[model samples]
Target: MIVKPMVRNNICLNAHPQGCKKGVEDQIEYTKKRITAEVKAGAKAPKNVLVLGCSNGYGLASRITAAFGYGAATIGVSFEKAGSETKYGTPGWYNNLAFDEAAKREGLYSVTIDGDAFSDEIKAQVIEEAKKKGIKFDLIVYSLASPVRTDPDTGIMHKSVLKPFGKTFTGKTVDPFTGELKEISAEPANDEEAAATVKVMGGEDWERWIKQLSKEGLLEEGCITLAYSYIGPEATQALYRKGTIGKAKEHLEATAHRLNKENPSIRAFVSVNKGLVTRASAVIPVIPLYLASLFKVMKEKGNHEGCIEQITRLYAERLYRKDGTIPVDEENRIRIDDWELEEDVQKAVSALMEKVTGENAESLTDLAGYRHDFLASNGFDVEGINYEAEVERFDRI
Candidate 1:
C-alpha cells in the first residue's frame, strides 16, 4: 500500500517505512563522517553508551553519534508501536529497525529494548543485558519526551501537561502548514496538575534510572549521564519556559546536581538544546511561530543545525573536549542553544515576529522550513524517497 503522511492539529498519525529508514541512514552517515573527523582531531570517545528514548529526536541522534561516530556499543530504549500487515507503525519503529540493521552491518554492537522505560522491569532487563555483554555503560543519555510516565516505585500513572503554572497564558501561534497566525490561550494548572506534570516530566525517573544502574554496577567509573532540556526566548517563557514543563526542567537540573553530589563516580548534567521542529515541539503553543522565525534567522546566518549536528557538537566540543574539560554554564548545565539564543539571532527573530501576520507568515518567516521539518520528522518530506511508490511491507523497514 502507498504510504503518505497524515497530519492534522500538528500531530502526524502515520509514517513511511522507507522514508524513516532513509532518514536514520542519513543521520548515521553524517555522524560517521563528523565523528571520524573529530576522532582524528583527538577528541575522546565513549566505549559503550546507553540512550533512553533512543528512537527519535536528540536521543536517536545521540545513539547514532555514539555507535556510528565513535564506535561505541549502544543499548537503546524506546517505546515504539510496531507495524502490522495493514498499518504502518510509528516513525520510531522504522527508525529503530534501520538503526539496528546499520549497526549490525558496521559491526557495531547494538541492542534495542522496546518497553515502558519508566518500569523497573525495563531497568532490570537493561542491567541483565549489560551483564550478559560484560560491558559497562560509560555514557548514558536521557532524552525521553513522553506525555505520561508511570512511577516504577508507586505503580501510579502521572500525566504531564503544557499549561502555565500560576496565571493564564495567551499568545500568538502559527500553524506550520496553513500559515495561520492565531491567538491561543491556556489556563493555569492547579496544584495537583502541576505536581503531576513535574512527576511525569521531571528528573525523578532519570535519577532512579541512574541510581539503579549504579547500584547494579553497570556504570563505569567517571561515567557521564546527560539529559536534554530547553530554555526558549522570552516570547515563549509564559507558555513554555516558565510553565509547568519549565518547573519539571528545573527539577531535572537540580537532579543533576544531586546525582553529582551523591554518586561522585558519575557526572550528570542537563544539556539545554536548541528549539527545533521536533514531534513534541510542534504542538506547543507559541513555539511554532517562534521556531519559524528562528529557523529563518539561523539559516540566513548559515548556522542552522538539526538534531544530529547538535548532538555531534555536544559530544565533540562539549562532552569529550580536547581541553580535558567539559564546558558548562554557572548552573552546571551545558548550553548548546547558544546559536539559537544569540543576541543578534534573537533580535532578528523578534523583528520578524513583530511584522509577521497571516498574510506574510510564509514570506517573513521560515514556515516552509518549519513545515518541512514537521513533515520530515514523520518521514513525509524526506529527500530521495518515492512517496508515490507502494510500501512493500508494513511489518518491517
Candidate 2:
C-alpha cells in the first residue's frame, strides 16, 4: 500500500512511516537546544522515567525531555498499533520505533509496551522490564488522551464523551479541512452517561498505577507522579471545564493530593496544562475557535509554546527548579498554563472571540495555524519531504 494521511473530523486514521519518524526527529532536535543550555549550567533532570500514553502529544514530549534533556532511561506503555505490509499502521507505532531507535544510539533505554495501558498486564510488563534492566523510575508522567477505557477490575468498558452538563452548549468549531467555522452544539449527558464518562476519565487508574508500582517496589524514593489535565478559561467551560470531563478532572486532582499526602517518599501532582490542539482537545466543541484566537495572541506576545516547549518549561522552571521544592498554585497543583491564563492573553482572545463569526474566522483568528498543527500531529504537511518516496518499512513493534 502507498501510505499517506487519512483524516476526518479532527481524527487521522492513516499515517506515513517516514513522516512519523521525521516528526519525532524534529521534536528531539528542538529539545536538544534546551538540553544543552541546562547542561552547561550544571542543572540535572530525571534519571529514570515512566510515561503512560507515551507516543504522541504531551506524553511523547515528556519522554524526549527525560531522554535527550536529562539522559534518563524510559519505559512507555500505550495502546498503539503498528503498521503492516498491506495496511498503514498508527503514527504512534512509528513514533515509538523511531524514538526507541534514536534513544538506543544515544546510549539511553526506551522500552515500549503497546497494549491496554489500563490493564495490570502492561504494568507487570513494565516492572519486569525495569527489574531486568536494573532501572528505577524516579518520575512517572500520566498523559493519556483516549476516548475509551476499560475497567481493569470489573471487565467493563467505559467510553468518554465530550458534551455539555446541564444546559445545551452551542458554540463555534473550525472545520478541520476547510478551515471554515461551524456552529456545533452538544446536549447535556444523561445520568448514566455522566457516570460512565467519569468512571473512565478520573484518576482511579492513575492511583492504580501508583499503588501497583509501589507494591512492586518499582518506584524510587522522592518519586513524583503527575497527571496531565486542562482547565481552559470560560470559552470552553461549557463543553470542557464544566462538563463531565471536568468532573473527572476534579477527581483526578483530588487523587493527586491524596497520594501525595499518603507517602513521604512520593508526591503526585495534577498539572493544569495550557490548552493546545490535541486529538482530545480538537474534538471538544468550540476549543478550536478558542485556541485559534489564542495562538494568534500568544505568538504575538512571544509566549507561544507547543507540547515540547510546555513540558520543557514545566520541568526547568516550575516542577524541577533549583530550590529542590516543587512549586504549586493556591490549590496545591502545578499551573503550567500561566501564560495561557495571563490577563492580557485572555483579554485579547476574549475580545477577538466576541467578534468572531463563522464567515470571518479566517481573517479574525489563526485557524490556518490551528489546522497545520492538527495535520502535523498525524505526520502530514512536513516540509521538504517526498511522500511518494519509499522508505524503510516497519510492520509492527
Candidate 3:
C-alpha cells in the first residue's frame, strides 16, 4: 500500500512507517551531535533510566537522549496499539519499533514494555525485569498524559476533565490549516469531576511507581525522579492553568515534595515545560492560537526548541549542571518554560494575536509552522521520505 497521511480537525489518524523511522533516526543523530561533548567532558548522567509514557512526544525524546546521547540503559513503558499486515496502528507503535531497532543496532540496552502503566502488574513486571538485568535506575521520568486511569487499588477507572475550576472560560483558538480564529467556552467542573480529574492525572501513580521501585531495591541511592507539567500564560490561565487539569498538576507537584520528605535519599521534582503541538495540546481550546503566535515570536527571537532540544538542554544545563546544583523557581519546580514565558516574548505574542484576522493570519502568525509540526509528528511532511513508495506490511517500520 502507498500510505498517505489521514487527518481531520487537527487530529492525524494514520502514520507512515519509513517516515516515522527516519524521524527517530534524525533525532538520534541530533542528540549524538549535540550531547556527546557534555558526556565526554565528565558530566554526571543517568546510568539506568525508566521512562513511563515513553513511546511518543516528550517521553520519546527523553528516552532517546538518555540511551543514545548519554549511553544509559533504558526501560520504557507505554500503552499503544500495534498494527497488522494490513491495518494501521498508532504512530507511537511505529515509534517504539524504530526505537527498539535503533537500540539493537547501536548495542544500547533498551527494553520497550506495552500495557497499562497505571497497573500494579506492569510495575511488578518492570521490577522483575530490572532484577534479572542487574539494573538499578538512577532516573525515573513520569510523563504519562492519559485522559483516563484505572485505580490499581480500587479497580475503578477515573476520567479527567479540562473544564475551568470555578467560572466559565471563553477563549480564542486558531484553525492551523485555515488560520481562522474562533471563540470557545467551557463550563466549570463540579466537585466530583474535579476530584476525578485529579485522581486520573495526578501523582498517585507516580508515587506508587517510586515506592514499588524502592521496595524492590531497583532505585540507586541519590536517584532523581521527574514528572512533567505545564503552566501556560494568563490568556490560557482560566482554561488550562486554573482548570481541573491544573488541580491535578498541583497534586503532582505536591507529590514531588511528598516523595522528597518520604525518602531523604531520593530527589523528586516537577518540570514545567513550554507549550508545544502535542497530541493532547492540539485539541485544547485557546492553545492552538497561542502556540501559533508563540512559534512566530520565538523563532524570530532565535530561541525555539522542540521536545528533543528541550530535553537535551535539560540534561546538559539544569539536571547535571557543572555546579552540581539543580535550579528551580520559588515554588520548587523546574522552569524550562522560562523562554516561553519571558516578558518580551509574551508581550510580542500578545501584540501579534491582537492583529490576527482570517485575511492576514497566514502573514501574521506561524500557523504554517504549527501545521508542519502537527503533521510531522504523525509521520507526514518529513524530509527524505517517498510517500509514493509501496509499504508491504503495516507491522514493520
lDDT of 3 by residue, 296-396 (tens): 99999999998899998888888877788899999899889999999999999999888888888888889888988898787888999988899999989
In terms of TM-score, how similar is model 1 to the real structure? 0.98
Which sections of candidate 1 miss by over 4 Å?
37-40
TM-score of each: 0.98, 0.95, 0.98
lDDT of 2 at 94: 84
What does the lDDT read for residue 374 in candidate 1? Answer: 84
RMSD of each: 1.2, 1.9, 1.2
Q: Model-by-model lDDT, in order? A: 0.89, 0.83, 0.89
Clashing pairs in 1: none
RMSD of 3: 1.2
Worst 10 residues of 1 by lDDT: 35-44
Q: Any runs in candidate 2 off by more than 4 Å, and if so which?
A: 37-44, 388-397
Candidate 3 stretches with Cα past 4 Å from truth are: 38-40
Where does candidate 3 have its weakest 10-residue lDDT segment? 36-45
Report lDDT (Cα) of residue 292, candidate 2: 89
